[PDB]
Write a protein that binds this ligand. Structure first.
Ligand SMILES: Nc1nc2c(ncn2[C@@H]2O[C@H](COP(=O)(O)OP(=O)(O)O)[C@@H](O)[C@H]2O)c(=O)[nH]1
Ligand SMILES: [Ca+2]
Ligand code: NA
Length: 156
């Protein structure tokens, strides 16, 4: 089956690990060593196509990434501001302005939202990529986030 090399990036504490573990292990991790950077495998069916996801969970194989999740936390304006810095890195590492990518706004279950949906959507539109609100806690949008990225790779 087709192997998709996915990579999760973003500021520290946005939920990169929590999203990866929730997708794969199907549980919400209370805490994850911020210094652990490793890849995790996951067999999955997307639109009737079975495939293996090789998900590199980065910590603050990178270059071989076929698709990237740019994650920020909706209760963290700084992490949202950091997004551009991460997208530009991916552009340079892949030597391409058109890399498969999705903007993820995590922790959408928290009431202390400081980054509006409209604000995040506009940024996604400026990048020409999909935007997806997620919660590693409740599982909202988690599958959709990774699956949409696979779909973006298929287009490319
Ligand atoms: N409420 C809430 N907390 C989250 C969510 N995702 C991650 N966290 C918390 O944020 C902290 C750091 O998450 P982590 O996965 O390590 O983010 P990372 O540093 O980018 O890998 C942990 O204490 C998690 O419990 C979420 O969707 N909702
Ligand atoms: Ca982590
Ligand atoms: Na790293």
């Amino acid at each position: 089956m087709t192997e998709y090399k996915l990579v999760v990036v973003g500021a520290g504490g946005v939920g990169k690990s929590a999203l990866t573990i929730q997708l794969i292990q199907n549980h919400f991790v209370d805490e994850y060593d911020p210094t652990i950077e490793d890849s995790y495998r996951k067999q999955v069916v997307i639109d009737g196509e079975t495939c293996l996801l090789d998900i590199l969970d980065t910590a603050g194989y990178m270059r071989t990434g076929e698709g990237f999740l740019c994650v920020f936390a909706i209760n963290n304006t700084k992490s949202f501001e950091d997004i551009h810095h991460y997208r530009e890195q991916i552009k340079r590492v892949k030597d391409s302005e058109d890399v498969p990518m999705v903007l993820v706004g995590n922790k959408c279950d928290l009431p202390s939202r400081t980054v509006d949906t409209k604000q995040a959507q506009d940024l996604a539109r400026s990048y020409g990529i999909p935007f997806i609100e997620t919660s590693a806690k409740t599982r909202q949008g988690v599958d959709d986030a990774f699956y949409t990225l696979v779909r973006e790779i298929r287009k490319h």
